[PDB]
Amino acid sequence: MIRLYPEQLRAQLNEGLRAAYLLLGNDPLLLQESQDAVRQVAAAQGFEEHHTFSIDPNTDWNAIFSLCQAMSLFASRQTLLLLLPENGPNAAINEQLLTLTGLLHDDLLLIVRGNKLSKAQENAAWFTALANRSVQVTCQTPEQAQLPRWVAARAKQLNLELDDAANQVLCYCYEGNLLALAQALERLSLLWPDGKLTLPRVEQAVNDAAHFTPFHWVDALLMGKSKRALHILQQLRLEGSEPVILLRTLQRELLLLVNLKRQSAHTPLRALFDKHRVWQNRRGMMGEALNRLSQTQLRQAVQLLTRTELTLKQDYGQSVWAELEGLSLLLCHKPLADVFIDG
Amino acid sequence: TSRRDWQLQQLGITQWSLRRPGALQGEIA
Amino acid sequence: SYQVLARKWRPQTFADVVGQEHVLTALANGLSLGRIHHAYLFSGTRGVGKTSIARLLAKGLNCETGITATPCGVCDNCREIEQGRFVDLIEIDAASRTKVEDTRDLLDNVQYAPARGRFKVYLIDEVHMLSRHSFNALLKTLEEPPEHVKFLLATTDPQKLPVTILSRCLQFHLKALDVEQIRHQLEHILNEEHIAHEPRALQLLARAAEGSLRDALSLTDQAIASGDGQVSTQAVSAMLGTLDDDQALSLVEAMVEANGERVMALINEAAARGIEWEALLVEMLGLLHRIAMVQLSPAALGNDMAAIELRMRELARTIPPTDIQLYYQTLLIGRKELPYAPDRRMGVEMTLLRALAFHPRMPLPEP
Amino acid sequence: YQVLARKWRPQTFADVVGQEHVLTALANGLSLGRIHHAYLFSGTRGVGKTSIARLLAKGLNCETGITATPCGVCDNCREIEQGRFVDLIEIDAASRTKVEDTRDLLDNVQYAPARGRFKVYLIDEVHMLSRHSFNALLKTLEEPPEHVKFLLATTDPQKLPVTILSRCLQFHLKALDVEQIRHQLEHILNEEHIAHEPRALQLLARAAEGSLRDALSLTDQAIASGDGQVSTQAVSAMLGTLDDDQALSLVEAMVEANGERVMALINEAAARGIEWEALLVEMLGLLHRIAMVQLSPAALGNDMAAIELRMRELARTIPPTDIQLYYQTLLIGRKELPYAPDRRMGVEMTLLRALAFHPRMPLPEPE
Amino acid sequence: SYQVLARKWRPQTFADVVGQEHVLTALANGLSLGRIHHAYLFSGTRGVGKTSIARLLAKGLNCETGITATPCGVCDNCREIEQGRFVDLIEIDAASRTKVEDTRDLLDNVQYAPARGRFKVYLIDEVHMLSRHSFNALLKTLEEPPEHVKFLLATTDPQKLPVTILSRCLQFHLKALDVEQIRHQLEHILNEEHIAHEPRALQLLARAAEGSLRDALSLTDQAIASGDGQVSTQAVSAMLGTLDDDQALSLVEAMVEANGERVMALINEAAARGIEWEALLVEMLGLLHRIAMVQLSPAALGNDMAAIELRMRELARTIPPTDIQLYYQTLLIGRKELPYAPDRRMGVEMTLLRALAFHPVPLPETT
Amino acid sequence: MRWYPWLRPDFEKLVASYQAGRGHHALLIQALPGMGDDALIYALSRYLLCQQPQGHKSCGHCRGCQLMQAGTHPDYYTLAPEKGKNTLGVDAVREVTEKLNEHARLGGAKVVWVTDAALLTDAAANALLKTLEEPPAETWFFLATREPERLLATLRSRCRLHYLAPPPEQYAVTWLSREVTMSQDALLAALRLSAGSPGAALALFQGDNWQARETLCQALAYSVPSGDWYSLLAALNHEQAPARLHWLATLLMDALKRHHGAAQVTNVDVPGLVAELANHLSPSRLQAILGDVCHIREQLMSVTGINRELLITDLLLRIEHYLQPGVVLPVPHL
Ligand SMILES: Nc1ncnc2c1ncn2[C@@H]1O[C@H](COP(=O)(O)OP(=O)(O)O)[C@@H](O)[C@H]1O
Ligand SMILES: Nc1ncnc2c1ncn2[C@@H]1O[C@H](COP(=O)(O)OP(=O)(O)O)[C@@H](O)[C@H]1O
Ligand SMILES: Nc1ncnc2c1ncn2[C@@H]1O[C@H](COP(=O)(O)OP(=O)(O)O)[C@@H](O)[C@H]1O
Ligand code: ALF
Ligand code: ALF
Ligand code: ALF
Ligand SMILES: [Mg+2]
Ligand SMILES: [Mg+2]
Ligand SMILES: [Mg+2]
Ligand SMILES: [Zn+2]
Ligand SMILES: [Zn+2]
Ligand SMILES: [Zn+2]
Ligand SMILES: [Zn+2]
Q1: Which of C242, D201, E168, E305 is the most exposed place for a label (fewest CB within 10 A)?
Q2: Are the beta carbons of D162 and C224 separated by less than 8 Å?
Q3: Distance of alpha carbon C20 from alpha carbon C40, whole angstroms
Q4: C37 CA distance to ligand 4 centroid (A)?
């Protein structure tokens, strides 16, 4: 299994094709670009048909097998594309894929698109069989740290002069949405033939389309950025996520912080992290939080979290978002009147 | 403080004290 | 007679549409340079010009003179598209027909060449209501579109569409029309219609529009009806007062400044319109909580509450936090004791009086 | 015997009580000819939404023409009065809310009206329509045929999508005043030749909140109970509300700390066999009225005139803190009443508790 | 076959219904005067005869002789309704027919003429259990139904019903039956059934009924089953667990003097004897109320407590009224939350501890 | 489901009624857990469904008895919560109501058994009202609960209530000694913890719950001197949290009673722990902790889907906070 990234796939395609291609990831833009590049190279090499299928319980595997076995009159070397479900293949789908790869032919070129497989899903007979003669491209959305580099590279590839302020604005507005950012770059290039982009020019034609996850909100709270946490919370509320997921995601981290603070009186932080198997990349951040919050805090937060949970799950109230915003401000170093805690 | 105040607090009755007499517009003693 | 003010003044040229400069400039440059995408997707709020811009693009994409951003408006194609009875312009209301069969037939219809136009444009409106199988069929048709077929999509909730369909089309997002542009458009329309007006009435109408030109035109028509063929400050103010439904913020503002008669007048006005008292009380609680959080951090107030941003920000700036906390506590107690009050209105009035000119005595740990 | 509500539905703009603004707007619109194609009506129950909608529909289709004062005698007016006109398509959205029904309705809107100049669709209970049904109507509402008009009536306009609200002219109906309800009831009873008294009409108007249909239903119930006449005693028995004099006397006795008088009055009330919950509610209402009078002199209406002066005497002598203490004590007593061993015991214990903590004359302590 | 006393003694005529005089008078007046309404809503507590009143009204409406307030009870229609097989009487268990489809099917059959009766009566039991869509669907037809259909609604939670439905119905409130009426009905039933009884047993059962006749009949049947076919005072006392002796007086005295050991020993002995804790709490509350009332005036003490008068007087001389109020409130709170405690004895002990702080094998066929 | 001897007298009454034909069609039995009300209901239903019973015993060889032993009798509808759930839905009640309309297949009586009336939701309870009020001929209902005051008043008023009295303490202790082998103090403590209901104490002994109780007692003994109640979390975070909270409340109540001075206590096997608990805490603080524990237990048992870990952590943090001087303690209120 040759593992690669979207930024280096072209050379491999220039080197030569293979029996099958795996496009696993989360970002849609990178997956679509890789699929288009692979299809273009295959068409240039002499591939004509472009059969596509979406994996579903109603899908008929007999037709796929017949296509893989039958031969066309005035065409050869057909290509097959599969769209896996978001959850991933199950045991029945695993057996179907095993049969399909058993019927795999050299002329047939197989492409699979979908989310990355978990530890259990990735370990399968069909996956192991394909690994011998497969190339997998990992398409993971870049994080906030790496986004400016990607934006600068894309702008340079398009022959555009992008300022630092413009790059920062584009990163802030379209964080987590590469497709929207690419379309915005295309629109900006179309608007200005000269290709010189300044801060006012980009500002006049940019909106908010950022996409976040609860983990980003929890990390923002831990670091202590009030504005970022509030923006993430507003974006998540507008998206329409379930508050219970946010509460459960925050509960584990809050309980871990409380336990460490209680046990940090007479124990080094490294020993506690090793005991709790805290991930290395987070360790420092965690420590920072453990230093910023006093012991009186992390008890009011727990009380407010419990009150919000009871309000949501008993009274079916609609004021959960306001309480979440209050708790977010509380986690950051702010006074808080303590009337809203209702302690 | 006072026994009466403690008893009223225990009974759950909340005692209200005027804060802005000027807000009221009328003959009040 | 007189048609409808909104329906009559639909823009018919790129110079008539007000605002949305970026979208118009991008479309004009693309048409001039020949860079035309295979699918467009217009998004925004209601009554901003999505359908109007789509129709203008369709008109300019099949003009007899040629592909241009300034269609003549006099040739047969332009006239027929204006009348909405052009052969090639296949406009489909996706909302009325969402089942797979209708979309299947419409997409199968693409195999034929255009009759009397260089392009056969499909204008699908309200695309978010299509069925899943309809989306699958549309994606299958749109993966490899013919050279003579173009798709125009108008939607208000783009997040409903699948990512696959979004990735295949260029998305243009429209913004709010702002107060000044709406006011200028209303002034121009009224001047063209030969109707008397006053600047303050137009300003009030623009403010009440809330970034929607269609709403502004509807309110202008209603005011003209109420004003007996003219727009006047008193008539528009009375109309807005009748339509006003923000009694919670007004009550909070009156209470915070220690006013009694104003609170009674607001309570009577709220009672005049069918309103649930507990809903009003919880709305006031939410407003006070938002003000407190804004005082804690200026970034608390999001973009959702843009209409009343200024007043809430001023209240947060001026009112000390302790008064906000006390008002929140007393209103919470009032909400708690509301169901046992003799009457909902009487209970609300009593709680307002307590928050206005009273102060509870805290238990104060004595031991 | 046809019920009063159905019999006395207004048949002309001169027979509608209140709602001056909407009537004036509709009259001006019909007179000037500026007629829209989508009207929405909002308000609390039983304030004349369907009535005015039907009146407007009759005015549009009158044979004499389009006037704000329909004749009421031509064939179209008579048929609409009898509810069998062919061009007035009345739809109960609550009963038919599925999307296919809306599709079927919209499939045959192009056909010309059978006999009238307009084909008026009147949809009731719009808020019950499904989301797909709401979306399916957008295009038709925006650009309907020239011979089609849509009339919509709903109780909670906040349930509709903002897109629909921007397409139609909105009129909000306000709750009727007590005096208007009393005058309408007096006129109806005079027309029906039924004996009545001013006190009974005042009580019925007070108990009707703001919906005239509730007032008519209560009047019918009172007539049934009163055996062909409306009497103050019959209304009092029906509502089960004791006269304000007894509650006022009890409150005065409690304020002056006269235990024997309070106990004697309670025993007399028990002999009368009145409801204890009603007594507590009346006392709480009296205390609330006194507090509001203290807040402002104008807080007291003429409904209490019979005792007004005496009540006003309590306003200038009792400090506000004592009023608040009594109100809270009675509220707590009413809160805990259900768990008391007996209603009489609960009320007696509440009164004893109020007397014991009297700010000025507490009961003597032991030695 | 054998039927319980609750269902076998269901009233069959307007002369067999105890109390509810105002409702019966109103119904008789309406039937006599010919003023027949199409929407009746009987509301009140449980076990008072809402369903029986509705059935009697329906029987009177569809009697062969005519519309009379005194149904004959012998014609074919009356006996058919009594047997429950009458075609035109549709009894709808709203608690099991809440879905909208059932209501829509019901409302589509309202346009057909009655089979044999002169009216088509719909008797909806527990209408408060229907969904919102069901209520909205009903609204339109219920507002103005055909002339041959009548709607009868029976419920015990009128708050659930939306205001829209309440605004278009004649509401009849049923009062709770007094102790004397329940005792009279019980003695009449027992005399008719040839069952021995004693006045004290009937008085106890009436007091325990809490104003519900169904509860009284159920308790009487339980006593008969466990009383060896005889309603004896001793058997009823044993079944109800009445304190009888002066245990409550000793417990309250121990609590007042703040002697933890004495009260704990008394509670342990009572638990060993196996008494009812709710009865003990009620007795203690009654004793506290009597002590407070006597403290108000020395002559307030009743003549039935002479045997324990003197001791009680001492309490009235040694305990300030505020302490009495505190003890009463604490006991009431303990009674309120007794069911939620892990054990009843634990709840009683917790309440008393709170109060003390106040001070200056033959196996048939089973595995 | 075992037949305890103390159920023999009450049965002898109930069946007698059904022998005379004057039997109520809706019997509601009140009993504590482990009393054996289910066995009584099963015996009554078995007697009713026997075709040719003799005396108070079913024949055991007729078609009805054979089907009952096989557990596939066409009659004898049973309502119980789903295997994965803990509540009875309206759908099952409505299905049983619909099926009750038709005649009895075997020509006998139809028996309906509700496993626990307290588990019924509001919709199911409201739906069952009309069926209970006027059931068809030869239809019998049986409901079991431990606290009839929790049920709806309308539902309660339609049923004849029969109460089972727990046997004398001495008899229960002797029976437990005959059954299980444990110290007298342990038997008394288990019996009192079960509200004096033999069979529940036996179930407590049979499982590992006694070891959990000992672990909780040791943890509390360690924690009380230190004032760090958070350590109790490990001993309370479990699917049986309500039982352990009940045990903690019992310990606190015993400590408070000892502080006030009393001769009878629930926890008889741990005098040292209760004495230490009383010595190290004030009566007001003990009252506050007991109230909070009871409230948390009630919330945990009532609300569905509530996360127990967070609730218990907040409870323990509040308990630790209260012990600090100058803190407003909670007061019960309406
Ligand atoms: N930019 C604009 N300039 C002038 N009129 C506009 C503009 N945007 C919307 N309108 C008005 O709105 C109506 C068209 O609604 P439209 O905005 O196309 O619907 P949507 O954008 O919700 O699809 C027309 O009557 C038109 O006068
Ligand atoms: N403005 C009004 N003038 C006279 N009667 C009215 C008015 N509004 C309501 N009513 C009375 O209320 C009853 C029901 O009105 P209805 O048509 O149901 O209004 P809505 O549609 O708002 O419920 C009618 O019998 C009518 O007489
Ligand atoms: N007023 C009454 N007079 C005589 N019996 C009554 C009365 N009210 C109720 N009952 C008895 O209660 C039983 C059930 O009454 P029910 O119809 O359920 O009233 P509700 O519908 O108010 O519960 C009847 O069998 C009847 O014997
Ligand atoms: F015309 Al729209 F949303 F109101 F597209
Ligand atoms: F018919 Al309505 F409010 F009850 F319009
Ligand atoms: F049948 Al009822 F209250 F109406 F028990
Ligand atoms: Mg549009
Ligand atoms: Mg209406
Ligand atoms: Mg009933
Ligand atoms: Zn042209
Ligand atoms: Zn006419
Ligand atoms: Zn008859
Ligand atoms: Zn047998």
Answers
A1: E305
A2: no
A3: 16
A4: 23
